[PDB]
């Protein structure tokens, strides 16, 4: 709600700082981290399904990083 689908890259970027300097921008990733750190269990899982699904090294790397960020 006023929690998600937060007017971000709609497209009115303007030379002068917006509403959340960069705190918001950085924060986001900052929290996946907190999370992933929390349940290595899933990091584990993910990377695995990775290792097998795909094959093209880069492939793996890719779906991996995703799955990670996919689950908030």
């Amino acid at each position: 709600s006023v929690a998600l689908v937060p007017h971000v890259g709609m497209g009115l970027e303007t030379a002068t700082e917006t509403w959340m300097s960069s705190e918001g921008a950085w924060k986001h990733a900052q929290r996946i981290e907190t999370w992933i750190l929390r349940h290595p269990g899933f990091t584990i899982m993910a990377a695995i399904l990775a290792y097998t699904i795909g094959t093209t090294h880069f492939q793996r790397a890719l779906i991996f990083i995703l799955l990670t960020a996919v689950a908030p």
Partner: protein
């Protein structure tokens, strides 16, 4: 003035094709322009007012429920119902409880029951739109010469404030003693409202993309509230929780203030309190020269006694702004000024104020030069050469061509299209340059909009790779496509 020490900045040495200067200005920017004549100018626009807008929508964020009743009817025979549902001013829900035999009902098995509440909103926020007609920009341009007013006097009176509304087109700027600078603002292609949604909020506001504004959840009103409360929704908030089976009732689900804020995290701040004057804008226009003559050019280049009053700063490679203080030889006149090279005359220092001119045998004027890269001498004053001030900069040629490459590149990848409007006059280059970045920009780079910056660069990478280990020529184009453009926007963007 009005710009000396403002970080954001930029110059424009050139009048071209007879007065044709092409400039773009955005609040914390002040564009300054020089010419092979004319007291160069410092342009800075500020107050950009809007007037007579309209309330288009009205999401509320502190809902509150009352009167709440609840009916049930029993297994099968009757999807329960009562009067209250009539007054859409309420809220309701048909649900299934296990009304059993002992419950004091019918023939147990399962049944219907609805819940209903009169829904009063407590503090909505209200959007607002503004027809571009009524988007009064204020432009404040000014000379130099200096004085007690000095640099960034801001709060005073110099250059005046020529206000311009597209409810007109070109405006004359009566500049004392100099003449009349003429500007052709294009306030109709700058911010680009009626695409934008002015939005107040408990007393603070945000300019925000129309779409998003017509999607954010919440219970909404229309435009003509005036005692209405027939809030389309309410379902966004208020929830009637039904534990395991029986009971089943309603609840507020709390306010939404801060929530709202946090959600709104991409729009720029603004105003609403004080005739909503939305800064942050950035309009362009043709600054039209001619009829804009320098002051002196008449009285002698007078000689005499003169001290100084301050050393010299320099924010932005070259901003040598020096304070002096003539005396003795009286009567308001010129000033002998040179930016010569250590002893051995071969002068080579860019002048920005284009000759000062004392005026009160007191008036400690101040010049503004752009000394060369290494060490430079500012020889100011003839006869016994009364004064030569040795200084030294750091105008390191290359360090220059680079910081420019970027800073410029930036002004590009912020404004887009109109970036080219910074280069006064076309001729295939800047003219067609725009013509292309115009569409190639509005397309790809601008047709995959709305994605958070993070994801943005992510695609940069995945693509640089799908590129990099390509297969015959096409890659180069693929890489570039990646590099800069995206990869860069990202490493930049997020205003």
């Amino acid at each position: 003035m009005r710009c000396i020490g403002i970080s954001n900045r930029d110059f424009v040495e050139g009048v071209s094709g007879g007065s044709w200067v092409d400039i773009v200005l955005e609040h914390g920017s002040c564009v300054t322009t020089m010419a092979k004549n004319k007291p160069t100018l410092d342009f800075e626009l500020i107050e950009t007012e809007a007037k007579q807008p309209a309330t288009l929508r009205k999401y509320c964020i502190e809902a509150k429920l009352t009167n709440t009743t609840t009916d049930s009817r029993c297994p099968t025979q009757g999807e329960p119902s009562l009067n209250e549902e009539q007054d859409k001013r309420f809220v309701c829900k048909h649900s299934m409880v296990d009304r059993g035999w002992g419950n004091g009902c019918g023939l147990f098995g399962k049944g219907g029951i609805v819940t209903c509440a009169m829904f009063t909103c407590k503090k909505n926020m209200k959007g607002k739109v503004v027809q571009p007609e009524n988007l009064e920009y204020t432009i404040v341009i000014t000379p130099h010469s200096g004085e007690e007013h000095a640099v960034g006097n801001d709060t005073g009176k110099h250059g005046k404030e020529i206000k311009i509304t597209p409810q007109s087109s070109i405006t004359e700027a009566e500049l004392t003693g100099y003449g009349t600078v003429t500007m052709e603002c294009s306030p109709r292609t700058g911010l680009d409202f009626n695409e934008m949604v002015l939005l107040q909020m408990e007393n603070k506001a945000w300019l925000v993309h129309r779409q998003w504004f017509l999607d954010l959840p919440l219970p909404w009103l229309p435009g003509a509230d005036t005692q209405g409360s027939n809030w389309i929704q309410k379902e966004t908030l208020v929830t009637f929780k039904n534990p395991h089976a029986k009971k089943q009732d309603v609840v507020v689900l709390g306010s939404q203030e801060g929530a709202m804020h946090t959600a709104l995290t991409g729009a720029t701040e603004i105003q609403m309190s004080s005739g909503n004057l939305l800064f942050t804008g950035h309009l362009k226009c043709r600054l039209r020269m001619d009829k804009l003559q320098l002051k002196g050019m008449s009285y002698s280049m007078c000689t005499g006694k003169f001290k100084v009053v301050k050393e010299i700063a320099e924010t932005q490679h070259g901003t040598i702004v020096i304070r002096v203080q003539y005396e003795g030889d009286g009567s308001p006149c010129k000033i002998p000024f040179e930016i010569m090279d250590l002893e051995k005359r071969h002068v080579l220092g860019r002048l920005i104020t284009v000759n000062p001119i004392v005026t009160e045998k007191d008036s400690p004027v101040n010049i503004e030069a752009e000394p060369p890269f290494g060490d430079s001498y500012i020889i100011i004053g003839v006869e016994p050469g009364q004064l030569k001030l040795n200084w030294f900069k750091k105008g390191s040629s290359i360090g220059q061509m680079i910081e420019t490459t970027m800073r410029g590149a930036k002004r590009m990848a912020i404004l887009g299209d109109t970036a080219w409007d910074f280069g006064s006059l076309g001729g295939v280059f800047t003219s067609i340059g725009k013509a292309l970045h115009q569409v190639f920009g509005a397309i790809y780079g601008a047709a995959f909009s709305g994605v958070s910056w993070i994801m943005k660069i992510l695609i940069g990478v995945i693509i640089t790779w799908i590129g990099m280990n390509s297969r015959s020529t096409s890659l180069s184009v693929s890489l570039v496509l990646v590099g800069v453009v995206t990869l860069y926007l990202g490493v930049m963007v997020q205003a």
